[PDB]
Design a protein around this ligand. Structure first.
Ligand SMILES: CCCCCCCCO[C@@H]1O[C@H](CO)[C@@H](O)[C@H](O)[C@H]1O
Ligand SMILES: CCCCCCCCO[C@@H]1O[C@H](CO)[C@@H](O)[C@H](O)[C@H]1O
Ligand SMILES: CCCCCCCCO[C@@H]1O[C@H](CO)[C@@H](O)[C@H](O)[C@H]1O
Ligand SMILES: CCCCCCCCO[C@@H]1O[C@H](CO)[C@@H](O)[C@H](O)[C@H]1O
Ligand SMILES: CCCCCCCCO[C@@H]1O[C@H](CO)[C@@H](O)[C@H](O)[C@H]1O
Ligand SMILES: CCCCCCCCO[C@@H]1O[C@H](CO)[C@@H](O)[C@H](O)[C@H]1O
Ligand SMILES: CCCCCCCCO[C@@H]1O[C@H](CO)[C@@H](O)[C@H](O)[C@H]1O
Ligand SMILES: CCCCCCCCO[C@@H]1O[C@H](CO)[C@@H](O)[C@H](O)[C@H]1O
Ligand SMILES: CCCCCCCCO[C@@H]1O[C@H](CO)[C@@H](O)[C@H](O)[C@H]1O
Ligand SMILES: CCCCCCCCO[C@@H]1O[C@H](CO)[C@@H](O)[C@H](O)[C@H]1O
Ligand code: MET
Ligand code: MET
Ligand code: NA
Ligand code: NA
Ligand code: NA
Ligand code: NA
Lengths: 509, 509
């Protein structure tokens, strides 16, 4: 089995895993839609009661599985709970990162395509004051790229450039992953993360200098970091904050687990996991929070910046921000640095969500790294044609895997590790080899508070929020549902083949 | 490896393979649309120049592969041609019967649902002379069953009864296939085929007694068996006749090959294959030809019977015939016997098109029969939800696999066996163990005439007929195309896993 060469490489790879498009695109939208500072109290509490404990659990499960040659949850869940139902629940930790990769790599490719177009100056020129005469050209620019429907048919028409840039993006992911853990993922992370940090700081500084008749960047920071205790009784904010915590830290994705399975059995996971989790939050609240919102608030004021955020997840990052930058000197290049930042942020996360599938093929079906990587790319590339060509397929995949799936899988893996396997065995496995120990209070948080927190959250979700999505959507959602259910069955069949191969292997030695 | 117990069982199983819904539903529609007797000259020539030679080739390939423990074309194509490209072309002989099973078993289930409803008398009552007041209730009866779209959305809404009858149909297929070759397929065929023959003869006799002011059954037989030499210059008729020959004899489906791989290495295939092929043609031209057309012609006259046939493939068998029967004493029960005949005809063919997938899983991935059958059922059952719920998905699958696919695969397997492997080695393999020898002229037919016949046919197809289907269809065809292309990739991945398993097996002994 491969291992992380250096401790820094481990940290930066796990930080690259977490620090992605969730920090710079998703977080600003979530915070703005949910009252800015009103979102932040629930967010900080969710980091403390869910984010930190689950991160530790996933490192522990990972390292534990890796010590026996298993990187993924079908096998690992079985080690912790010797039951057939554990292998089947384990499939979600292959399915979730597979479904996420299918749309996530595609969005990642947009940032590469935009970066190329912004560098070379093939960008829209707004007329040289009206807010709609400035935003519209950039809206049309995004809409032509991805091919937003112009009529009634729920069909997308990606531009030829967008399609080819997706191929290149797939190729860049393959070129890193094919070199492995230490020579691929680890080496790249040591380059990407410093680059990512420098680009983000420069952008924050530039944005901090923005001032118009409508306000300054400081007004954005006031909006984001000013508490509103009247939203603490709103369950919608709590649900939003916990979902962002999961997405942002890569929890319930099976990706922290796969990476941790390359950590040596003896090596520290307590301080290392805390550092990775803390690095992500800095990149999220300080860097990600200080770019999009303050720029939007400076140019448009608070109320218009909120309305922009509610309109679309991609509105703020792909339309509004570049439009704002175009009104400043050197703004096209500043647009390039933004999209380049997003590309590197995405690339380090997409190599993380494809590694579980690769680890499964190597560990359980004994494929070489070359074949495991190429087949994984092939499945992701093929399946992405659904997201590329069917309108709202992306949204459906993001909901079932990236939103519902991750919270469900987070609760599941906590139950399996801390209740079934055993709380005291779990607690010991977490702390073993630790440079620091997990604060004692977290034993009771992990065992009682976190599972009750997530169970109540998921109950309110299924009752008050998902009956609408099951009944008030266009019929084409069943195409995506049909396909991703098929993907689960496919992966189940692979788990079946893996165990039959094991049975023949045990009848041969 | 399993083997057919008796020679009769072999014959009746291979006859059950060929004699299906193609004989009783597809053939009447094809003949009527193409000028009746005008269709028959090309049909007889296609039987002689394509049907007979290819049947022999598929028995030979099958038996040859079976002698080395291989039932399916990925392996068999490789034995005949030791090239990587041969295994990939071999996938079509898993893909075609898999895609065909997905829609064919569903249509088979309609005949079971209709049989149950006709037996119990839950049928429409037409008013006790107007042709539309009689046909409409039966049209509505079929349309409610399968859930034909009432609006603009390309969405089907199967009745609860139809869905449950599909489950039962899947279960009946499983219950036969799970018992194996001799104890399942062979035992059932010895019951089904005699039953099928008796039911068909009784129906022919009953139909022969039909006489109205618009004509008799004899007028139907005159229409069908009267030559029109002015259509012999029409390429559309030739294309139609060859397509029916392929479909009707199960050629290019990989199903004759899989069945033949259970024939002992020494056993006769020349007389046995000719008998099976000849039994099918009797059931097709004498039995299938004498039911639907003569009844339609008796009640409506020739021109109206032709128009009915052009309206739909299911119009004649599921709407018109039962409507005609309802005007006769005991007609509901006669409706039952028709649908019962269709069910048994379908069931013996669907167990044949699922056996390739089962043979692959047993032979190459070393799954037990139980697991191979259940996983095959699972994939077919799951994938059938596409055909059940998306309007015209059935048509798209029938075209790419059941129409284009089979002719392409027929030409491919002939090239591999008679050109690459070697004409003289092929000829020897066919004749070895023969109770009779293949007439010498067929060597030159197999080597020169048949391949040139099919190549010219496929050229005119791609030039004059398929650009319309690629450009003049609704966008929803790309859902079915996307899914069945995914199925090909899935099966390719399984061929990849099968060879990796072989490589580990050869490094273990
Ligand atoms: C291996 C997967 C094949 C699935 C068929 C998808 C064909 C892709 O179609 C391509 O889409 C691009 C983006 O819209 C267009 O610019 C190209 O003209 C078109 O060839
Ligand atoms: C970074 C490498 C990706 C480059 C892909 C180029 C795809 C070609 O894209 C073409 O460009 C033309 C000129 O701009 C346009 O007029 C055409 O509409 C477009 O199809
Ligand atoms: C679920 C996704 C199915 C993949 C279908 C890919 C669409 C390829 O289809 C082609 O796309 C081109 C560009 O969009 C169009 O110009 C062509 O008319 C169309 O045939
Ligand atoms: C759920 C929120 C918990 C976060 C608070 C963590 C602060 C650490 O809490 C510390 O833990 C140490 C080790 O158990 C104790 O020795 C100290 O008394 C205690 O202050
Ligand atoms: C491609 C085949 C899809 C067929 C399934 C469509 C059945 C229509 O079901 C639709 O489902 C939607 C989402 O749950 C709901 O919002 C709609 O109310 C409902 O009409
Ligand atoms: C394992 C495959 C699950 C895919 C979801 C398909 C759910 C089937 O849906 C069923 O369809 C029937 C026929 O229209 C209806 O009569 C039933 O009310 C409905 O439950
Ligand atoms: C042969 C066994 C299959 C029987 C399945 C029965 C499915 C129940 O079907 C129900 O039947 C009712 C009474 O006819 C109808 O009123 C309902 O609309 C229908 O849902
Ligand atoms: C590609 C096929 C996707 C499978 C979708 C199955 C549709 C299940 O969806 C359900 O179907 C019922 C009966 O049609 C409807 O009454 C319900 O509104 C719908 O939710
Ligand atoms: C392509 C149409 C061919 C069908 C005709 C088959 C009739 C059999 O043809 C016979 O073959 C025998 C064995 O080779 C010869 O001994 C006979 O002379 C010949 O009449
Ligand atoms: C589910 C995603 C499907 C997206 C692909 C639809 C692209 C539209 O392409 C359509 O293809 C049809 C069939 O080839 C043609 O008949 C139409 O002319 C064409 O517009
Ligand atoms: C490792 S991919 C999961 C999402 C990622 N943590 C992000 O924030 O973009
Ligand atoms: C063996 S399934 C192929 C079709 C079948 N020969 C029929 O006529 O229905
Ligand atoms: Na990242
Ligand atoms: Na993140
Ligand atoms: Na049959
Ligand atoms: Na037939």
């Amino acid at each position: 089995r491969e291992h992380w060469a250096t401790r820094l490489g481990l940290i930066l790879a796990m930080a690259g895993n977490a620090v992605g498009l969730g920090n710079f695109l998703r977080f600003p939208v979530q915070a703005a839609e949910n009252g800015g500072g009103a979102f932040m109290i629930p967010y900080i509490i969710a980091f403390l009661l869910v984010g930190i404990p689950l991160m530790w659990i996933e490192w522990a499960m990972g390292r534990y599985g890796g010590a026996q040659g298993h990187g993924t949850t079908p096998a690992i869940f079985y080690l912790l709970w010797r039951n057939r139902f554990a292998k089947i629940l384990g499939v979600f930790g292959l399915w979730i990162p597979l479904v996420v990769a299918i749309y996530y790599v595609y969005i990642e490719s947009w940032t590469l395509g935009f970066a190329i177009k912004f560098l070379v100056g093939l960008v829209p020129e707004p007329p040289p004051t009206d807010p709609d005469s400035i935003l519209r050209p950039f809206k049309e620019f995004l809409y032509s790229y991805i091919g937003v429907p112009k009529g009634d048919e729920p069909i997308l028409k990606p531009s030829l450039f967008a399609y080819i840039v997706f191929l290149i993006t797939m190729f860049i992911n393959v070129s890193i992953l094919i070199r492995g853990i230490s020579k691929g993922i680890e080496r790249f992370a040591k380059i990407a993360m410093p680059t990512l940090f420098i680009l983000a700081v420069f952008l924050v500084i530039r944005v901090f200098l923005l001032e118009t008749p409508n306000g300054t960047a400081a007004d954005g920071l006031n909006f984001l970091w000013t508490p509103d205790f009247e939203k603490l009784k709103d369950p919608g904010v709590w649900i939003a904050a916990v979902g962002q915590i999961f997405f942002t830290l890569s929890l319930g994705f099976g990706a922290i687990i796969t990476y941790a399975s390359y950590v040596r059995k003896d090596q520290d996971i307590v301080l290392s996991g805390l550092t990775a989790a803390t690095l992500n939050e800095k990149a999220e609240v300080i860097l990600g929070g200080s770019i999009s919102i303050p720029a939007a608030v400076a140019f448009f004021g608070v109320a218009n910046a909120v309305a922009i955020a509610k309109a679309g997840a991609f509105n703020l990052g792909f339309i509004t921000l570049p439009a704002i930058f175009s009104q400043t000197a050197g703004g096209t290049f500043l647009g390039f640095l933004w999209f380049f930042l997003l590309f590197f942020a995405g690339l380090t996360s997409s190599i993380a969500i494809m590694q579980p599938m690769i680890a499964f093929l190597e560990d359980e079906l004994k494929l070489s790294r070359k074949h495991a990587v190429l087949w994984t790319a092939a499945i992701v590339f093929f399946s992405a044609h659904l997201v590329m060509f069917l309108n709202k397929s992306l949204d459906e995949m993001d909901f079932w895997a990236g939103t519902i799936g991750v919270v469900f899988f987070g609760l599941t893996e906590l139950i399996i590790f801390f209740w079934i396997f055993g709380a005291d065995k779990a607690w010991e496995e977490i702390n073993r080899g630790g440079i620091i120990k997990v604060p004692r209070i977290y034993y009771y948080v992990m065992r009682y508070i976190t599972p009750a927190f997530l169970a109540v959250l998921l109950v309110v979700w299924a009752r008050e929020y998902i009956p609408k999505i099951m009944e008030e959507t266009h019929w084409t959602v069943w195409i995506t549902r049909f396909y991703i259910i098929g993907l689960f069955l496919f992966l189940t069949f692979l788990v079946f083949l893996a165990e039959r191969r094991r049975n023949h292997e045990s009848a041969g030695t």
